[PDB]
Design a protein around this motif. Structure first.
Motif, PDB file in Angstrom:
ATOM      1  N   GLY B  49       0.794  -1.214   0.000  1.00 54.09           N
ATOM      2  CA  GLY B  49       0.000   0.000   0.000  1.00 54.09           C
ATOM      3  C   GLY B  49       0.831   1.272   0.000  1.00 54.09           C
ATOM      4  N   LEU B  50       1.895   1.296   0.797  1.00 54.94           N
ATOM      5  CA  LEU B  50       2.757   2.479   0.868  1.00 54.94           C
ATOM      6  C   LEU B  50       3.448   2.704  -0.469  1.00 54.94           C
ATOM      7  CD1 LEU B  50       5.160   3.533   3.700  1.00 54.94           C
ATOM      8  CD2 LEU B  50       6.049   3.267   1.365  1.00 54.94           C
ATOM      9  N   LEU B  51       3.947   1.626  -1.066  1.00 55.58           N
ATOM     10  CA  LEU B  51       4.627   1.740  -2.351  1.00 55.58           C
ATOM     11  C   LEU B  51       3.701   2.301  -3.430  1.00 55.58           C
ATOM     12  CD1 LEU B  51       6.671  -1.575  -2.312  1.00 55.58           C
ATOM     13  CD2 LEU B  51       7.617   0.729  -2.478  1.00 55.58           C
ATOM     14  N   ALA B  52       2.486   1.765  -3.493  1.00 56.95           N
ATOM     15  CA  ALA B  52       1.500   2.185  -4.484  1.00 56.95           C
ATOM     16  C   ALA B  52       1.128   3.664  -4.398  1.00 56.95           C
ATOM     17  CB  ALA B  52       0.237   1.312  -4.365  1.00 56.95           C
ATOM     18  N   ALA B  53       1.025   4.197  -3.185  1.00 55.34           N
ATOM     19  CA  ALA B  53       0.668   5.599  -3.016  1.00 55.34           C
ATOM     20  C   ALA B  53       1.870   6.534  -2.909  1.00 55.34           C
ATOM     21  CB  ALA B  53      -0.220   5.763  -1.789  1.00 55.34           C
ATOM     22  N   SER B  54       3.074   5.988  -3.029  1.00 50.20           N
ATOM     23  CA  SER B  54       4.291   6.794  -2.921  1.00 50.20           C
ATOM     24  C   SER B  54       4.568   7.637  -4.159  1.00 50.20           C
ATOM     25  CB  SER B  54       5.500   5.896  -2.670  1.00 50.20           C
ATOM     26  OG  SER B  54       5.815   5.140  -3.830  1.00 50.20           O
ATOM     27  N   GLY B  55       4.075   7.177  -5.305  1.00 48.50           N
ATOM     28  CA  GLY B  55       4.297   7.892  -6.547  1.00 48.50           C
ATOM     29  C   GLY B  55       5.698   7.662  -7.084  1.00 48.50           C
ATOM     30  N   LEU B  56       6.445   6.785  -6.423  1.00 45.25           N
ATOM     31  CA  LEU B  56       7.810   6.478  -6.838  1.00 45.25           C
ATOM     32  C   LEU B  56       7.859   5.322  -7.832  1.00 45.25           C
ATOM     33  CD1 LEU B  56       9.318   6.275  -3.238  1.00 45.25           C
ATOM     34  CD2 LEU B  56       9.657   8.231  -4.801  1.00 45.25           C
ATOM     35  N   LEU B  57       8.982   5.222  -8.538  1.00 45.06           N
ATOM     36  CA  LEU B  57       9.218   4.136  -9.480  1.00 45.06           C
ATOM     37  C   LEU B  57       9.787   3.047  -8.580  1.00 45.06           C
ATOM     38  CD1 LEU B  57       9.615   2.797 -12.168  1.00 45.06           C
ATOM     39  CD2 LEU B  57      11.787   4.038 -12.410  1.00 45.06           C
ATOM     40  N   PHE B  58       9.182   1.867  -8.572  1.00 44.08           N
ATOM     41  CA  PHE B  58       9.665   0.832  -7.669  1.00 44.08           C
ATOM     42  C   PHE B  58       9.461  -0.590  -8.143  1.00 44.08           C
ATOM     43  CE2 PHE B  58       5.172   1.178  -6.766  1.00 44.08           C
ATOM     44  CZ  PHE B  58       4.796  -0.140  -6.563  1.00 44.08           C
ATOM     45  N   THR B  59      10.078  -1.506  -7.405  1.00 41.60           N
ATOM     46  CA  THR B  59       9.956  -2.937  -7.628  1.00 41.60           C
ATOM     47  C   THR B  59       9.872  -3.486  -6.208  1.00 41.60           C
ATOM     48  OG1 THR B  59      11.275  -2.957  -9.663  1.00 41.60           O
ATOM     49  CG2 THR B  59      11.040  -5.037  -8.481  1.00 41.60           C
ATOM     50  N   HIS B  60       8.884  -4.339  -5.965  1.00 42.80           N
ATOM     51  CA  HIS B  60       8.650  -4.914  -4.647  1.00 42.80           C
ATOM     52  C   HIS B  60       9.096  -6.377  -4.613  1.00 42.80           C
ATOM     53  CE1 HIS B  60       5.411  -5.548  -1.239  1.00 42.80           C
ATOM     54  NE2 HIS B  60       6.614  -5.969  -0.894  1.00 42.80           N
ATOM     55  N   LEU B  61      10.001  -6.709  -3.695  1.00 42.05           N
ATOM     56  CA  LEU B  61      10.483  -8.082  -3.581  1.00 42.05           C
ATOM     57  C   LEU B  61      10.340  -8.590  -2.155  1.00 42.05           C
ATOM     58  CD1 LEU B  61      12.664  -6.410  -5.639  1.00 42.05           C
ATOM     59  CD2 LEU B  61      13.193  -8.802  -6.121  1.00 42.05           C
ATOM     60  N   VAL B  62      10.360  -9.907  -1.985  1.00 48.67           N
ATOM     61  CA  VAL B  62      10.205 -10.500  -0.663  1.00 48.67           C
ATOM     62  C   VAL B  62      11.009 -11.781  -0.470  1.00 48.67           C
ATOM     63  CG1 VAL B  62       8.581 -11.368   1.064  1.00 48.67           C
ATOM     64  CG2 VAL B  62       7.846  -9.627  -0.597  1.00 48.67           C
ATOM     65  N   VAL B  63      11.626 -11.910   0.696  1.00 46.42           N
ATOM     66  CA  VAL B  63      12.394 -13.100   1.027  1.00 46.42           C
ATOM     67  C   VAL B  63      12.579 -13.097   2.531  1.00 46.42           C
ATOM     68  CG1 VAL B  63      14.638 -11.972   0.772  1.00 46.42           C
ATOM     69  CG2 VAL B  63      14.439 -14.460   0.549  1.00 46.42           C
ATOM     70  N   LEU B  64      12.260 -14.219   3.162  1.00 46.62           N
ATOM     71  CA  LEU B  64      12.366 -14.324   4.607  1.00 46.62           C
ATOM     72  C   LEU B  64      13.721 -14.792   5.124  1.00 46.62           C
ATOM     73  CD1 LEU B  64      10.794 -14.201   7.354  1.00 46.62           C
ATOM     74  CD2 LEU B  64      10.375 -16.635   7.025  1.00 46.62           C
ATOM     75  N   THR B  65      14.105 -14.253   6.275  1.00 47.17           N
ATOM     76  CA  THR B  65      15.341 -14.637   6.930  1.00 47.17           C
ATOM     77  C   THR B  65      14.863 -15.227   8.254  1.00 47.17           C
ATOM     78  OG1 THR B  65      16.605 -12.807   5.960  1.00 47.17           O
ATOM     79  CG2 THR B  65      17.517 -13.861   7.918  1.00 47.17           C
ATOM     80  N   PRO B  66      14.886 -16.565   8.371  1.00 50.75           N
ATOM     81  CA  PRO B  66      14.455 -17.286   9.573  1.00 50.75           C
ATOM     82  C   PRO B  66      14.866 -16.614  10.880  1.00 50.75           C
ATOM     83  CG  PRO B  66      15.035 -18.839   7.905  1.00 50.75           C
ATOM     84  CD  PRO B  66      15.475 -17.491   7.386  1.00 50.75           C
TER      85      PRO B  66
END
Ligand SMILES: O=c1ccn([C@@H]2O[C@H](COP(=O)(O)OP(=O)(O)O)[C@@H](O)[C@H]2O)c(=O)[nH]1
Ligand SMILES: O=c1ccn([C@@H]2O[C@H](COP(=O)(O)OP(=O)(O)O)[C@@H](O)[C@H]2O)c(=O)[nH]1
Ligand SMILES: [Mn+2]
Ligand SMILES: [Mn+2]
Lengths: 250, 247
Positions: B49-66
């Motif tokens: 949600g924050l990324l979408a309303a930021s107006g910035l050019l972005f790429t969203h990634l995810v990876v967990l660190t146990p």
């Protein structure tokens, strides 16, 4: 409408970093006048330089701080004095807005976090407006409870007796109302946690607060605090005469 | 010259506040692509949600660190190397041979706008002083005739690159040229930065910026953990802060 942001500040390791993020936040907001009040004996080149390079509309003020240890009380009152025509400008716009001028005053401490949206919420204030504040008062968020577009109570916990159980960052005041109430200021002798009420009690009654931020359902400001930096190495290097070059401002 | 800011982040009380000021800082910088990588079991609505309303050019990634955001930064580097992995925003990484600079910005430091204009001029690896880090007012390389000849540092000076994550930037071409260069999650305390840079350049070849390293344009600030004593007591009474109101 123009927003006058009142910010007390004092020199310490993290001062510049805090003023950098606050000024950068403010550069995103139109029609905003920053009233930066230094807790010093006179202006410092660090603050004077940052203001000048900020590109913002600002007025530089200065007043030294003279048991309860309230913070920034005298500095906030100094800005109120300037607004009421008592002068005190050491730089920037020297003349305060004249009577009749429409505006809103917000007291923004130099360490909190402010979303740009918050400012558009306070731009429409007739008397005193309010909104939730995150991570304050020992809660996830503290804020007014709204029913039918009116404030009917408060979500709070610490010292619930407070007539206005809200943080400094959770309200804004119409300029005309402050000029219309010359006695309204912060009381340095007020008990711990009752500073906000010492001003607000002179301006309005809780029932008349104007709910903003989607009827107080959105948190647009956070009462963040910055960790004191560790300086163990600096001290060792200093005792050896190899401290960080003081000619390089931090 | 486009700047790709790699930022690892994770859920905790102050996360949104930190992302708000970082995104607001980046909104002041032109030609910037934010690579926000969450250390979570899956993308959170808060970050999306924050990324979408930021107006910035972005790429969203995810990876967990146990946990220093090592795995997250490497996933951003994997993505940059065409290995995909984007779950939101611009999914297509820059095409092979593209120009650009990569900056690893943690979510709690304070960055001045000026810092970003310095790194655009990076050939290999650029460096500059960082304030309030390593136990010093500031830490930074010593420059003589436009060349790094030493480092103003104290905490274990044996690190080949005694510089904080916030004190350098890498040219995109150089990173693609060294496809094996990445952070070592097993690198001991303080050796994380060296684990990447050693694969890219020699300390002697670091390109000094910020006016030959005489200006501090970034600060290694940390945010206090908020007190929740009152929240806990209210929870016991069945009136904790409404979960539906995001903080
Ligand atoms: O001696 C002091 C202490 C604080 N302040 C300022 O006054 C405000 C309130 O203090 P602080 O943020 O430390 O309060 P807290 O986090 O405890 O509410 C901030 O804008 C500070 O920069 C000041 O001007 N002089
Ligand atoms: O479990 C964790 C802890 C930290 N971080 C992130 O990784 C970076 C480094 O951690 P931190 O800021 O706490 O490091 P420090 O200030 O202590 O060097 C930051 O961007 C964090 O948001 C993360 O992604 N997962
Ligand atoms: Mn504060
Ligand atoms: Mn950090």
């Amino acid at each position: 409408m123009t927003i006058y942001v009142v910010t007390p500040t004092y020199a310490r390791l993290v001062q510049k970093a805090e003023l950098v993020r606050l000024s950068q936040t403010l550069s995103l907001v139109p029609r905003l006048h920053w009233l930066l009040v230094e807790d010093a004996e006179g202006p410092t080149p660090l603050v004077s330089g940052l203001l000048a390079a900020s590109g913002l509309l600002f007025t530089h003020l200065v007043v030294l701080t003279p048991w309860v240890h309230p913070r920034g009380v005298e500095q906030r009152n100094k800005a109120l004095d300037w607004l009421r025509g008592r002068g005190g400008a050491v730089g920037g716009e020297k003349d305060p807005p004249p009577p009749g001028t429409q505006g809103v005053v917000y007291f923004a401490d130099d360490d909190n976090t402010y979303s740009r949206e918050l400012f558009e919420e306070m731009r429409w204030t007739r008397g005193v407006s309010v909104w939730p504040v995150g991570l304050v008062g020992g809660l996830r968020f503290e804020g007014p409870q709204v029913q039918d577009g009116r404030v009917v109570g408060f979500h709070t916990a610490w010292e619930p007796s407070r007539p206005f159980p809200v943080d400094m960052a959770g309200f804004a005041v119409a300029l005309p109302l402050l000029l219309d109430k010359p006695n309204a200021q912060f009381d340095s002798t007020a008990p711990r946690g009752h500073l906000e009420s010492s001003l607000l009690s002179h301006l309005v009654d809780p029932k008349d607060l104007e709910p903003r931020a989607a009827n107080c359902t959105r948190v647009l400001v956070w009462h963040t605090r910055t960790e004191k930096p560790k300086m163990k190495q600096e001290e060792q290097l200093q005792r050896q005469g190899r401290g960080s070059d003081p000619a390089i401002e931090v």
